[PDB]
Amino acid sequence: GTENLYFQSMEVYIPSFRYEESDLERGYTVFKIEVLMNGRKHFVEKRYSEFHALHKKLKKCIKTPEIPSKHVRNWVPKVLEQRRQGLETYLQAVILENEELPKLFLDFLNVRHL
Amino acid sequence: GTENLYFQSMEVYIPSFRYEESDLERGYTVFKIEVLMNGRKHFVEKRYSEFHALHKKLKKCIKTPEIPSKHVRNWVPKVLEQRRQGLETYLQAVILENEELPKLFLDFLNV
């Protein structure tokens, strides 16, 4: 009843990000996606470039939301926060607008059908 | 022979860091310290604030090396790297300057 509320729709957030630099390697920023579904919670880590690659493919499947821009000061923490918010809104909009999600999108979130 | 003798050998490096931001929290940085001694290596992670908490205590024990400033508003990549290097130099200076290391320093390094 209210329990059925746990099995209706995938609820996605991006509550955090991290920028990491190891030894002499180039730094990179990863967004930590939280997926709530069927009363369970799962985390998935993705770089912006992976969202952008997803987007390019998804556009061939569905009408997509606007992706947050690649043309941002992607080294500035407050800009990275805005991007986090934008990516979160993007994933949520895909879920809201598309009753049957493309396998491309499920794969991105490590969700499988049947 | 040399049964009662041992090497006093410790080296420290900070090879990596991560800056973490999460929705209702202040962003913070965690530094990974590599500790080498007596033929073995281990790692310990410390937030930037933990270095300053160490420093405050250490000053009561010994004359400390210079440390980078306690507060950092904006962790852009060049500041992250500058603070990594500064903190590394600080830990290495403590080891070079002090024949007998304070227990509170050893505890910080998990030795």
Swiss-Prot record, chain A:
Keywords: Acetylation, Cytoplasmic vesicle, Lipid-binding, Membrane, Phosphoprotein, Protein transport, Transport. It is found in: Cytoplasmic vesicle membrane. A 1,2-diacyl-sn-glycero-3-phospho-(1D-myo-inositol-3-phosphate) binds at residues 47, 49, 70, 83. One of its GO terms (biological process) is protein transport. The modification N-acetylmethionine is found at residue 10. Residues 10-114 form the PX domain. Belongs to the sorting nexin family. The PX domain mediates specific binding to membranes enriched in phosphatidylinositol 3-phosphate (PtdIns(P3)). This is Sorting nexin-24. It comes from Homo sapiens (Human). The chain holds residues 1 to 105 of 169 of the full protein.
From Swiss-Prot, chain B:
Keywords: Acetylation, Cytoplasmic vesicle, Lipid-binding, Membrane, Phosphoprotein, Protein transport, Transport. One of its GO terms (molecular function) is phosphatidylinositol-5-phosphate binding. It is found in: Cytoplasmic vesicle membrane. The modification N-acetylmethionine is found at residue 10. Residues 10-111 form the PX domain. A 1,2-diacyl-sn-glycero-3-phospho-(1D-myo-inositol-3-phosphate) binds at residues 47, 49, 70, 83. One of its GO terms (cellular component) is cytoplasmic vesicle membrane. The keyword NADP does not apply. One of its GO terms (biological process) is protein transport. It comes from the Eukaryota. Coiled coil: none annotated. It is a peripheral membrane protein. Belongs to the sorting nexin family. The PX domain mediates specific binding to membranes enriched in phosphatidylinositol 3-phosphate (PtdIns(P3)). May be involved in several stages of intracellular trafficking. This is Sorting nexin-24. It comes from Homo sapiens (Human). The gene is SNX24.
